[PDB]
Amino acid sequence: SMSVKKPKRDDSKDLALCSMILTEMETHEDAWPFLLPVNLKLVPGYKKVIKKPMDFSTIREKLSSGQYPNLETFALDVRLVFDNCETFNEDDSDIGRAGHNMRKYFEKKWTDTFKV
Ligand SMILES: CC(=O)c1cc(-c2ccccc2CO)c2cc(Oc3ccccc3)ccn12
Structure with missing residues (x-):
């Protein structure tokens, strides 16, 4: 509260660390559905549903241009990729499988990096 400062974690490396995680995501063999925006003129329904x-x-551009205030806002956008994927795609599809795999991959990096 006012003039009572709570201990806070050291956030000084967060940008570099989130960038490293994103790099690992981008170079994953199952990243292919997620590298660019879903093409809204080519995928019927996407724009309405998602x-x-x-x-x-888009996450890379945001990270490079100071559009994430903190590491949690970055994780929210990563998870949004996968949440969108599950909404639109059958779990039993190549893209649906890729999304599950990438989410698992991300979350373990997230925990290993930032949870002590
Ligand atoms: C993430 C997601 O839902 C997604 C991604 C694609 C996709 C993957 C590789 C290249 C291009 C695209 C579309 O921009 C995709 C495609 C989808 O539907 C189609 C499947 C096959 C041919 C055309 C469209 C649906 C979802 N996604």
């Missing part, structure tokens, strides 16, 4: 599209190139 209210907040997100993809790795």
Whole structure:
């Protein structure tokens, strides 16, 4: 509260670390569905159904331009990629399988990096 400062974790390396995680995501063999925005003129329904599209190139641009206030806002956008994927794609599809794999991959990096 006012003039009572709580201990806070050291956030000084967060940008570099989130960048490293994103790099690992981008170079994963199952990243292919997620590298660019879903093409809204080519995928019927996407624009209507998925209210907040997100993809790795958009996350990279945001990270490079200071558009994430903190590491949690970055994780929210990464998870949004996978949540969109599950909404639109059958779990039993190549893209649906890729999304599950990439989410698992991400979350373990996230825990290993930032949870002590
Ligand atoms: C993430 C997602 O839902 C997704 C991604 C694609 C995709 C993957 C590689 C290249 C291009 C695209 C589309 O921009 C994709 C495609 C989808 O539907 C199609 C499947 C086959 C041919 C054309 C469209 C649906 C979802 N995604």
